[PDB]
Design an enzyme around this catalytic site. Structure first.
Site, short mmCIF file in Angstrom:
data_model
loop_
_atom_site.label_atom_id
_atom_site.label_comp_id
_atom_site.label_asym_id
_atom_site.label_seq_id
_atom_site.Cartn_x
_atom_site.Cartn_y
_atom_site.Cartn_z
N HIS A 65 41.53 35.61 43.00
CA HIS A 65 40.65 35.83 41.86
C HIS A 65 39.28 35.22 42.12
CE1 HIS A 65 39.73 36.20 37.47
NE2 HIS A 65 38.91 35.21 37.78
N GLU A 66 39.26 33.93 42.47
CA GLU A 66 37.98 33.26 42.71
C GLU A 66 37.14 33.98 43.77
OE1 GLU A 66 36.72 31.44 40.68
OE2 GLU A 66 38.52 31.08 39.47
N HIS B 263 35.02 36.74 42.59
CA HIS B 263 33.72 36.27 42.12
C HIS B 263 32.79 36.01 43.28
CE1 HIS B 263 35.06 36.17 38.04
NE2 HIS B 263 35.85 35.12 38.19
N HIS C 273 34.71 39.57 35.63
CA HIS C 273 35.99 39.83 35.01
C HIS C 273 36.20 41.28 34.58
CE1 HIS C 273 36.02 35.28 34.10
NE2 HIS C 273 36.70 35.53 35.20
C1 WGG Z 1 40.94 31.67 37.00
O1 WGG Z 1 41.38 32.76 36.17
C2 WGG Z 1 42.29 33.53 36.90
C3 WGG Z 1 42.82 33.15 38.11
C4 WGG Z 1 43.73 33.97 38.75
C5 WGG Z 1 44.09 35.17 38.19
C6 WGG Z 1 43.56 35.56 36.98
C7 WGG Z 1 43.90 36.86 36.30
N1 WGG Z 1 44.84 37.69 37.00
C8 WGG Z 1 46.14 37.30 36.92
O2 WGG Z 1 46.56 36.39 36.23
C9 WGG Z 1 47.12 38.06 37.79
N2 WGG Z 1 46.73 39.09 38.47
C10 WGG Z 1 47.70 39.73 39.25
C11 WGG Z 1 47.34 40.83 39.99
C12 WGG Z 1 48.28 41.48 40.78
C13 WGG Z 1 49.58 41.03 40.83
C14 WGG Z 1 49.95 39.92 40.09
C15 WGG Z 1 49.00 39.29 39.31
C16 WGG Z 1 49.40 38.11 38.53
O3 WGG Z 1 50.55 37.71 38.57
N3 WGG Z 1 48.39 37.55 37.79
C17 WGG Z 1 42.66 34.73 36.35
ZN ZN Z 2 37.21 34.44 36.84
#
Ligand code: WGG
Ligand code: ZN
Ligand code: CA
Ligand code: CA
Ligand code: NA
Ligand code: ZN
Length: 166
Positions: free
Chosen positions: A119-120, A123, A129
């Site tokens: 995720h990071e 960015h 987002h």
């Molecule tokens: C710092 O904020 C953050 C940090 C990390 C993630 C997120 C948002 N995405 C998820 O939580 C997520 N995406 C997936 C995508 C594909 C498969 C599984 C998942 C899963 O298991 N989770 C926000």
């Molecule tokens: Zn973010």
């Protein structure tokens, strides 16, 4: 002459990163593995290449810190803010900071380092987002074989192209 690019992206495909320091929570190897997998999530669907530097200045400076750690985005202790990264650019651009008041894991416990890193690095590469609650770039951490959701594929490819499609 050159106007600034329409979107914040890296103007090179070859990016470096540096694990500046490491969390207590996981071994050096576990952290390196997590970040390696998190970068590959993006390089697999674009023409981006990521090289790890052991030292020196890298495009993406990765570090673990708590509270005030040298930017305008102090962390807040356990829970709440987890990590943040800066969009493509010089200096702190591309850098990713992880809140070491969190428990970072390679499991479903605490916060999954790989998942938050992936995720990071979104960015760091120019993604904000997504509204898609299934997307990697969705604002809220939840935990689930990892597959980059199509929304994140579309976003990153809008920036860098698909790279080799096979
Ligand atoms: C710092 O904020 C953050 C940090 C990390 C993630 C997120 C948002 N995405 C998820 O939580 C997520 N995406 C997936 C995508 C594909 C498969 C599984 C998942 C899963 O298991 N989770 C926000
Ligand atoms: Zn973010
Ligand atoms: Ca926190
Ligand atoms: Ca940087
Ligand atoms: Na920690
Ligand atoms: Zn920071």
């Amino acid at each position: 002459y050159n106007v600034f690019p329409r979107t914040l992206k890296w103007s090179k495909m070859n990016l470096t990163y540096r694990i500046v320091n490491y969390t207590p929570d996981m071994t050096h190897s576990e952290v390196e593995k997590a970040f390696k997998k998190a970068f590959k999530v993006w390089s697999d669907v674009t023409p981006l290449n990521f090289t790890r530097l052991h030292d020196g200045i890298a495009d993406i400076m990765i570090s673990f810190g708590i509270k005030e750690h040298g930017d305008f985005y102090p962390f807040d202790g356990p829970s709440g803010l987890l990590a943040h990264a800066f969009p493509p650019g010089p200096n702190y651009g591309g850098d990713a900071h992880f809140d070491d008041d969190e428990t970072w894991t390679s499991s479903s416990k605490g916060y999954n380092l790989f998942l938050v890193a992936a995720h990071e690095f979104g960015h760091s590469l120019g993604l904000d987002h997504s509204k898609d609650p299934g997307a990697l770039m969705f604002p809220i951490y939840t935990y689930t074989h990892f597959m980059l959701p199509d929304d994140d594929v579309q976003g990153i490819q809008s920036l860098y192209g698909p790279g080799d499609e096979d």
